[PDB]
Amino acid sequence: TSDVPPAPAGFDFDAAKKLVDVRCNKCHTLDSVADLFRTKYKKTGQVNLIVKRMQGFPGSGISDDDAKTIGIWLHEKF
Numbered sequence: 148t149s150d151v152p153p154a155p156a157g158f159d160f161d162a163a164k165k166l167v168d169v170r171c172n173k174c175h176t177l178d179s180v181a182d183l184f185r186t187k188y189k190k191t192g193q194v195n196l197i198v199k200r201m202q203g204f205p206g207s208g209i210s211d212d213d214a215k216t217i218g219i220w221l222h223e224k225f
């Protein structure tokens with residue numbers, strides 16, 4: 148099952164995508180890991196696992212709230 152639950156009703160996916168773009172292109176492009184992300188993490192319901200790993204890296208600048216938003220968008224839209 149997914150480690151990211153369904154978005155709150157009325158979730159702003161457009162704003163969430165902007166936050167993904169800001170947070171997940173700083174150290175590497177999201178594009179450079181996109182295929183791997185989909186097969187290894189999204190397909191296996193482990194989106195939160197990888198987002199939290201990235202958050203824990205030095206200089207990630209990812210807050211707990213950012214991680215929630217980013218996980219929802221990656222899980223539902225990426």
Ligand code: HEC
Pocket residue numbers: 170171172173174175180181183184187197198201202204205206207208209217
């Ligand atoms: C602080 C720098 C940094 C930020 C910000 C960052 N990453 Fe990473 N990312 C890394 C490093 C370093 C690696 C290579 C080591 C590894 O695989 O964990 C990596 C690798 C990855 C991988 C490949 C993991 C694998 O199994 O090979 C994925 C997917 C990924 N990042 C997704 C993301 C997403 C999604 C975000 C935004 C939440 C993000 N990254 C933000 C540093 C960062």
Ligand code: NA
Pocket residue numbers: 176
């Ligand atoms: Na680059």
